[PDB]
Design a protein around this nucleic acid. Sequence first.
DNA 1: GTCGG
DNA 2: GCTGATGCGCC
DNA 3: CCGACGGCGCATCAGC
Length: 333
Amino acid sequence: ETLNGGITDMLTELANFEKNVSQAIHKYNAYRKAASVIAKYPHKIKSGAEAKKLPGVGTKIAEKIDEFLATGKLRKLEKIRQDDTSSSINFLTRVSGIGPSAARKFVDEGIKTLEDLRKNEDKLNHHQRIGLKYFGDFEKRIPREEMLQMQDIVLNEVKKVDSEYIATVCGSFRRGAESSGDMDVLLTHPSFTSESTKQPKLLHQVVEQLQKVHFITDTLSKGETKFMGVCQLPSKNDEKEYPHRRIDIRLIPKDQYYCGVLYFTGSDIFNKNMRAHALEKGFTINEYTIRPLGVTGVAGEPLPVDSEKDIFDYIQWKYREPKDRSEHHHHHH
DNA sequence: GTCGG
DNA sequence: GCTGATGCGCC
DNA sequence: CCGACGGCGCATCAGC
Ligand SMILES: [Mn+2]
Ligand SMILES: [Mn+2]
Ligand SMILES: [Mn+2]
Ligand SMILES: [Mn+2]
Ligand SMILES: [Mn+2]
Ligand SMILES: [Mn+2]
Ligand code: NA
Ligand code: NA
Ligand code: NA
Ligand code: NA
Ligand code: NA
Ligand code: NA
Ligand code: NA
């Protein structure tokens, strides 16, 4: 059903090879960009020349597209698929906590399959152990209806610790997706701003309560402002158990909420595009601030921002609503 | 790998 | 302890 | 070996 679906799958697959196997993070991003603009292109691509007009598609991808349009495949990708070392490395990176470095190391030590991973628990750190343990569950997408139940648990229990926390479920959920990979919760509290931490355990207290009602079930990593863990909906009595889910919680300075929500709403590729455009307009954006770059490449004072749209306005973009910050594709008949 | 120099 | 590099993660 | 490319939190290491 997807317009230019073959091409866009081909680019995503090369991208992943580059990140996981080549550890070539810049080529990964070039292939992701190429895939993103091709998938948002509303016409069927017929040659490499055409694709080459799109920003981020250059001679080599045009050559591949030309090849893919002739044969319906890419010999470069056939070779990679036959390579059992690449394949196992690629696979191992899908476990949370195993990245391209650990995957390569595991694979040359004879750990090539899940079965092999579950045999060598003792080599895994705590993150990796938890990612192994929930590997199948984490592959499942969360239906928006379960996101609503998880939301109702998180808001209720946040309120119970302190009425002046505000929690906002961002990510794909806030962009309106019908399913989400995980749940990302943006949290503020007026004791925490860019200038002061008036209370010390602001994030912890929330996490503690979420463990106490048995909603958060495991921890991957945790600091003063970002928690990363596992969570799970409580089931109907006797009914089947719900799969475990990833949950991310980020506490942001109350007075930098808009930059924070912009960041945490994504998509990841919108953020990258938006922040790249800001750079070429002479601004630098992160989850806290938008700052102008000095003539010498150095960021100055933060600019005032009273809404998400103020940030767009600064870099001369039409405000795009959350739903329009997702990636999209087109269809053929 | 692509683009701005 | 601090700073800076590497690895892995978030959007 | 042209160099930038989005920006940063948490975990852990190295060197001081
Ligand atoms: Mn579709
Ligand atoms: Mn489009
Ligand atoms: Mn998410
Ligand atoms: Mn997440
Ligand atoms: Mn028809
Ligand atoms: Mn994501
Ligand atoms: Na097609
Ligand atoms: Na181009
Ligand atoms: Na991974
Ligand atoms: Na920890
Ligand atoms: Na489970
Ligand atoms: Na631009
Ligand atoms: Na205002």
